[PDB]
Amino acid sequence: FMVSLPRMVYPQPKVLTPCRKDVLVVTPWLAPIVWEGTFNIDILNEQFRLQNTTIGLTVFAIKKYVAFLKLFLETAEKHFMVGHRVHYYVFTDQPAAVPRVTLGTGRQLSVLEVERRFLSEVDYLVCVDVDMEFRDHVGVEILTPLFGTLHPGFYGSSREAFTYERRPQSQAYIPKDEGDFYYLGGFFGGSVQEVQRLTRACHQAMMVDQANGIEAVWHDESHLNKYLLRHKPTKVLSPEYLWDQQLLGWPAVLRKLRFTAVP
Numbered sequence: 001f002m003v004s005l006p007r008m009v010y011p012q013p014k015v016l017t018p019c020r021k022d023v024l025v026v027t028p029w030l031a032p033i034v035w036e037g038t039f040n041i042d043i044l045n046e047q048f049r050l051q052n053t054t055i056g057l058t059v060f061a062i063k064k065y066v067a068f069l070k071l072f073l074e075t076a077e078k079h080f081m082v083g084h085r086v087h088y089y090v091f092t093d094q095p096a097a098v099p100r101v102t103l104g105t106g107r108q109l110s111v112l113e114v115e116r117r118f119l120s121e122v123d124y125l126v127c128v129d130v131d132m133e134f135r136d137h138v139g140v141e142i143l144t145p146l147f148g149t150l151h152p153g154f155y156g157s158s159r160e161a162f163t164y165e166r167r168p169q170s171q172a173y174i175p176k177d178e179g180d181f182y183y184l185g186g187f188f189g190g191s192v193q194e195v196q197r198l199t200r201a202c203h204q205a206m207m208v209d210q211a212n213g214i215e216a217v218w219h220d221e222s223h224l225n226k227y228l229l230r231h232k233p234t235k236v237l238s239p240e241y242l243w244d245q246q247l248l249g250w251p252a253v254l255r256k257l258r259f260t261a262v263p
C-alpha cells in the first residue's frame with residue numbers, strides 16, 4: 001500500500017518536448033534508461049521515503065583491495081542514497097583492516113568475514129566493486145526489481161563488438177545476432193529476491209562451465225550479460241553510473257560522472 005504524495009511544486013513535464021534528444025531513455029521492453037535530466041529526484045525521494053526504503057550496498061574487499069574501503073565508504077556517505085536507510089555489507093578476509101568510517105544517521109555497516117538475512121534487513125541490494133569512488137549523486141532513481149549498468153566501453157558499440165562469451169560450449173554463450181547492451185559486472189542490483197535469483201543462476205551456470213572445463217571470457221560479467229539478456233532488467237543505468245575518467249575522459253553525453261574508477 002502506497003500512501004498519497006504531498007502537494008509538490010515543480011516544473012510541468014512537457015509531452016511535446018523530449019527529455020533528451022541525444023540518447024535513448026527507454027529500452028524496447030519499456031524499462032527506463034537512467035540519464036541525468038530524465039528524473040525529478042524530489043518526486044522519487046518522496047515515493048521511496050514514504051515506503052521507508054532500506055538499501056543494502058555490498059562490496060567484496062579481499063587482500064590488497066581492503067585499501068580502497070576508506071575512500072569508497074567516505075564518498076558513499078556523501079553521494080549514495082543520502083536521506084534513506086542504508087546498510088553496507090563489507091565482505092573481506094581482513095575484518096580488522098576495515099577502516100573506521102563515520103556514518104550518517106540511519107546508516108550502518110556490517111563486516112562479514114570470508115543470504116536469508118538480506119530478505120529481512122533490506123528492500124534492495126546494490127552490488128558494486130570496491131576500487132571505486134562516488135563523485136556525484138547515486139540515489140533512488142536506480143531502484144527497481146532488477147537493474148544492469150551500461151559498460152562505459154561499449155555503450156556506443158554494435159552488438160557484434162560486445163565482448164560476450166562467443167563459445168557455444170559455455171552457458172554464457174551469446175551469438176553475434178543477439179544482445180541488447182553490454183552490462184558491467186561491477187554495478188547491478190534490484191530487489192533482494194531478484195538479485196538472489198540472478199546470483200543463484202550465475203553460480204549454477206558457472207559450475208556447469210567448470211564441470212565442462214570452460215571459463216567464460218569475462219567470468220562473472222559474461223554470465224551476468226547472458227542472464228540480463230534472457231531476463232530483461234526493469235531499469236538500465238547509463239554510463240554516468242560507472243565511468244573511468246582517466247581512460248575515457250568526460251564526453252558531452254555525460255552531464256555527471258557519479259561513480260568512477262580510482263586512478
Ligand SMILES: CC(=O)N[C@@H]1[C@@H](O)[C@H](O[C@@H]2O[C@H](CO)[C@H](O)[C@H](O)[C@H]2O)[C@@H](CO)O[C@@H]1O
Nearest residue numbers: 151152153154157163184185218221247248
Ligand atoms: C571497446 C573496448 O575494447 N573497451 C575497453 C574496455 O572493455 C576495457 O574495460 C574492460 O572491459 C572488459 C570487457 O571487454 C571487462 O569488463 C574488464 O573488466 C574491463 O576492465 C577498458 C579498460 O581496459 O578499455 C577499453 O575501454
Ligand SMILES: [Cl-]
Nearest residue numbers: 127128129186
Ligand atoms: Cl558485486
Ligand SMILES: [Hg+2]
Nearest residue numbers: 019020037038
Ligand atoms: Hg526530461
Ligand SMILES: [Hg+2]
Nearest residue numbers: 058125126127
Ligand atoms: Hg550483492
Ligand SMILES: [Hg+2]
Nearest residue numbers: 202203206220
Ligand atoms: Hg557467479
Ligand SMILES: [Hg+2]
Nearest residue numbers: 202220223224
Ligand atoms: Hg551474475
